Design a binder for this molecule. Sequence first.
Ligand SMILES: [Ca+2]
Ligand SMILES: [Ca+2]
Ligand SMILES: [Ca+2]
Ligand SMILES: [Ca+2]
Ligand SMILES: [Ca+2]
Ligand SMILES: [Ca+2]
Ligand SMILES: [Cl-]
Ligand SMILES: [Cl-]
Length: 136
Amino acid sequence: AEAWYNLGNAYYKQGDYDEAIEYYQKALELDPRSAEAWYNLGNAYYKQGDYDEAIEYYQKALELDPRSAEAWYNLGNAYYKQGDYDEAIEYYQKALELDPRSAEAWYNLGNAYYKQGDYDEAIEYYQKALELDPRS
Ligand SMILES: [Ca+2]
Ligand SMILES: [Ca+2]
Ligand SMILES: [Ca+2]
Ligand SMILES: [Ca+2]
Ligand SMILES: [Ca+2]
Ligand SMILES: [Ca+2]
Ligand SMILES: [Cl-]
Ligand SMILES: [Cl-]
């Protein structure tokens, strides 16, 4: 499974998402408990704009590794990119329970509230992001 997974990664890194998906699928045929292969399959679908499918595969990754702050964050992002800002908030909150020093997750939580039209909440979360990283 590891060799097919790393072949998929190399294709992913050169932007060949169709081939990455094929080889991640082969990895998952050999090891259906690879949280890494489920996550990277979700990422390849995310890169193609296929958020519905990305969410299915992130959910599988989270069944195997529920302490994946990464999967929770990208699951949030897959809803955010669709305009599903209240779903995004739930998964950014879960990412931040696991990694409360993630300036990225706080910032994106603020962005979701901004997009919901709650500017006072956006301000709180942006202030938290800027406390952790005042450079952007
Ligand atoms: Ca669909
Ligand atoms: Ca849909
Ligand atoms: Ca489809
Ligand atoms: Ca983890
Ligand atoms: Ca949609
Ligand atoms: Ca909504
Ligand atoms: Cl769906
Ligand atoms: Cl929908």
